[PDB]
Amino acid sequence: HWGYGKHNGPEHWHKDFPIAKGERQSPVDIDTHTAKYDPSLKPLSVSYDQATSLRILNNGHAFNVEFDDSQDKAVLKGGPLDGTYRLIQFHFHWGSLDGQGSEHTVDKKKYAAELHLVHWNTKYGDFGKAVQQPDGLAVLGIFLKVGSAKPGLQKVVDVLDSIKTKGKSADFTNFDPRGLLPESLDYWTYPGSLTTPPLLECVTWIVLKEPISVSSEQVLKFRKLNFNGEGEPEELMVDNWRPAQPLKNRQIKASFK
Ligand SMILES: Cc1ccc(O)c(S)c1
Ligand SMILES: [Zn+2]
């Protein structure tokens, strides 16, 4: 099945998921000079004060920090969005080397990793019905660069050794995703897709301009995770990013001058 290696990586995914060569695939390169400022974008509203994390899971492709999305807590609205989108999980994509890892790129620059905070449009009732709709998801994408540590990330880094391999989970309560956000909410936005199979075209992407800084030791610990299950040959969970896809008939809009 699918993954990130030579035989089952991004160049292969189209055979099981033909939408891989669709009209609104993600990620894309963000050409900052041609992304036009849109003064009709309303400001972005991230309301994470009542977020309830539950668990962290190694799914064999990344790790997910999962949230209780059974009530009106942890919502994203405003910006380009009509309505309210509820946080369900976040995960990262990262590299084997600090010079690569992000899925979106900014004027072809690759960051060391990228955070995806995944939210579903509450008008569709749950995640599974929302990924059947073209406006079902909003993903807040945040770039990571290597420099100073991100103190708000440490509780995640410290739990990773308990979920080394595919299928492992760990209780992960009371984690506050506000500690993963940069100062500014200036962003670029465009219509796209999941960047992993099943590659569904449901996503309004909101990619923050300001990266967060994480330390070299924090990212090194992401790179000790494993794609394989326990008892299987070790394959380090690194380079779980899809490269940029054709922009096709899309415009990227900037929230800022
Ligand atoms: C499950 C899932 C939801 C949203 C996403 O952007 C990605 S990459 C994966
Ligand atoms: Zn992702």
Curated annotation (Swiss-Prot):
Site (Fine-tunes the proton-transfer properties of H-64): 4, 59, 64
Mutagenesis or variant effect for residue 59 to H: Reduced proton transfer
Effect of residue 114 to Q: Strongly reduced activity and sulfonamide affinity
Modified residues (Phosphoserine): 162, 169
Cofactor descriptive note: Zinc. Can also use cobalt(II) with lower efficiency, but not copper(II), nickel(II) and manganese(II).
Listed result of changing residue 91 to Y: In OPTB3; partial loss of activity
Binding-site residues, substrate: 195-196
Alphabetic keyword roster: Acetylation, Cell membrane, Cytoplasm, Disease variant, Lyase, Membrane, Metal-binding, Osteopetrosis, Phosphoprotein, Zinc
Broad class of where this protein is predominantly found: cytoplasm
The keyword Membrane is assigned to this record: yes
EC number: 4.2.1.1, 4.2.1.69
Effect recorded for residue 64 to Q: 2-fold decrease in enzyme efficiency, as determined by kcat/KM ratio, and efficiently inhibited by chlorzolamide
Activity regulation information from UniProt: Activated by X-ray, histamine, L-adrenaline, L- and D-phenylalanine, L- and D-histidine, L-His-OMe and beta-Ala-His (carnosine).
Required co-factors: Zn(2+); Co(2+)
Catalysed reactions listed for this entry: hydrogencarbonate + H(+) = CO2 + H2O; urea = cyanamide + H2O
GO molecular function: arylesterase activity; carbonate dehydratase activity; cyanamide hydratase activity; zinc ion binding
Residues where Zn(2+) binds: 91, 93, 116
Mutagenesis or variant effect for residue 62 to S: 2-fold decrease in enzyme efficiency, as determined by kcat/KM ratio, and efficiently inhibited by chlorzolamide
Compartments where located: Cytoplasm; Cell membrane
Binding partners and assembly: Interacts with SLC4A4. Interaction with SLC4A7 regulates SLC4A7 transporter activity. Interacts with SLC26A6 isoform 4 (via C-terminus cytoplasmic domain).
Disease: Osteopetrosis, autosomal recessive 3: A rare genetic disease characterized by abnormally dense bone, due to defective resorption of immature bone. Osteopetrosis occurs in two forms: a severe autosomal recessive form occurring in utero, infancy, or childhood, and a benign autosomal dominant form occurring in adolescence or adulthood. Recessive osteopetrosis commonly manifests in early infancy with macrocephaly, feeding difficulties, evolving blindness and deafness, bone marrow failure, severe anemia, and hepatosplenomegaly.
Similarity annotation: Belongs to the alpha-carbonic anhydrase family.
Name recorded for this polypeptide: Carbonic anhydrase 2
Natural source organism: Homo sapiens (Human)
